[PDB]
Amino acid sequence: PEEAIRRAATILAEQLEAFVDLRDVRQPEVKEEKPEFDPILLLPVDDLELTV
DNA sequence: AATCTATCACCGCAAGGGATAAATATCTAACACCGTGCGTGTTGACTATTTTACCTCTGGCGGTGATAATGGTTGCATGTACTAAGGAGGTTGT
């Protein structure tokens, strides 16, 4: 389950035609985000640049 | 505990979205002034703060009435189911 997740769950990209613009009408509304910056002592191990 | 090939995919690395912070412009608030009026001060006359004195409230409680009145109240403990004990007394027995 440490492999069988990171595209195995994003199959959600195949369950969303029912709900998030069913048609052809993307509208002006945002994504409104989360930033925390380099090189803060709290930053994830991914901020060493990794390998699969 | 090292090796990797061969998974399912994260990175490989192009694009672009929001963000925030700069500059501007607006807002308000903090203040310093002024003016008001109140609680700044002593003095003085008031009248009723307190005390004691006096004259005379409220409520302390002790005292007990007499034409005569002279057989009383009191209602439901409980109705069941048990059974252990004591109580009775005549008698046929110990």
UniProtKB/Swiss-Prot annotation:
It comes from the Bacteria. (Microbial infection) ADP-ribosylated on both alpha subunits by the phage T4 protein ModA. ADP-ribosylated on only one of the alpha subunits by the phage T4 protein Alt. Transmembrane segments: none annotated. DNA-dependent RNA polymerase (RNAP) catalyzes the transcription of DNA into RNA using the four ribonucleoside triphosphates as substrates. This subunit plays an important role in subunit assembly since its dimerization is the first step in the sequential assembly of subunits to form the holoenzyme. Belongs to the RNA polymerase alpha chain family. The N-terminal domain is essential for RNAP assembly and basal transcription, whereas the C-terminal domain is involved in interaction with transcriptional regulators (such as CRP) and with upstream promoter elements. Homodimer. The RNAP catalytic core consists of 2 alpha, 1 beta, 1 beta' and 1 omega subunit. When a sigma factor is associated with the core the holoenzyme is formed, which can initiate transcription. Both the N- and C-terminus interact with different regions of transcriptional regulator CRP. The rRNA transcription and antitermination complex (rrnTAC) consists of RNAP, NusA, NusB, NusE (rpsJ), NusG, SubB, ribosomal protein S4, DNA and precursor rRNA; S4 is more flexible than other subunits. This is DNA-directed RNA polymerase subunit alpha. The gene is rpoA. The chain holds residues 213 to 264 of 329 of the full protein.
